């Protein structure tokens, strides 16, 4: 990944009166992206936990026929 949740929080753009984007619209959308990056950071571990649970649940099933 080129960015972190932190880099996106830290980022600042140049302001303008010349038909720039609404700042609060941009910052609200980037806050949703910040959340998503947090989740991206934990995702590999969450895939691992979920596949281990996947496996445990499948063993239990086969054992119960």
């Amino acid at each position: 990944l080129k960015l972190s949740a932190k880099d996106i929080y830290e980022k600042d753009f140049e302001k303008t009166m010349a038909r720039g984007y609404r700042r609060e619209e941009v910052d609200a959308f980037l806050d949703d992206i910040i959340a998503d990056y947090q989740k991206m950071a934990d995702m590999n571990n969450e895939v691992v936990k979920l596949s281990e649970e996947n496996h445990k649940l499948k063993k239990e099933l086969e054992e119960l026929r």
Binding site: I8, Y9, E24, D27, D31, I34
Partner: peptide, 7 residues
């Protein structure tokens, strides 16, 4: 959270 980061 950058929506609340000014004023």
């Amino acid at each position: 959270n950058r929506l609340f980061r000014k004023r």
